[PDB]
Amino acid sequence: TTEVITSRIEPANRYVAEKLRITPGQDILYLERLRSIGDEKAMLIENRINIELCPGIVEIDFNQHNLFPTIESLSKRKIRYSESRYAARLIGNERGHFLDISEDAPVLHLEQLVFFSRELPVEFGNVWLKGNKYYLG
């Protein structure tokens, strides 16, 4: 199970804009999603999506649709590449609350950049994994 906690259209900050190769300040879609595995909360996902590439994405209910299939349909583009970077973090109070983790608990943090083509990023995700690596394999 993945449930949408919140969404928002927000201006891309400089870091996010650099990752997505867009102009700082350009509106992007922010999605926060809580993924649970067997009715235990696995991970907290914060997706930031370049909406210029997928006309209509802001109107989707992602409690009812899957994110990446929807990106692909609306763009009529295939996802061809991914990069991830893995780091230790100490979750935080608010994120903590979503995952139960004790605030200040250490979690695996992943940043992932998702591309249609080598030169066209579409989505930049931050993942808070309270368990153990598994984007590998």
Add this chain to the structure above:
Amino acid sequence: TTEVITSRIEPANRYVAEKLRITPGQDILYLERLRSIGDEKAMLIENRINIELCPGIVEIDFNQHNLFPTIESLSKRKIRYSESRYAARLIGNERGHFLDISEDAPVLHLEQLVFFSRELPVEFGNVWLKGNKYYLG
């Protein structure tokens, strides 16, 4: 469940050597692993591992140990980056047999390069996924 089908020490071919940034011909460990999800076969994984970075890895039974945790223990290095590239393929006869797919069926093919540091790759995997993207998110 993941089960080891086979393993082999083999010389790195030019493509694999370039991915792993090693000298063509250098011995690497090849592992073929079949991952099943709930007693249905999910994916076929072929890992190729630079053994110079993990003294002892060739002696492990990965029916009894997890691959990436073991890479990390033996190297005393953390995995910090991943890149994947996704492509459509038509499985093949022998791979087909491992996944049941009809030979010549189309599957999602992933190549994934796993790094300790930006300049030090450790593993180059080919994954045959007969279902649908999910390294994303």
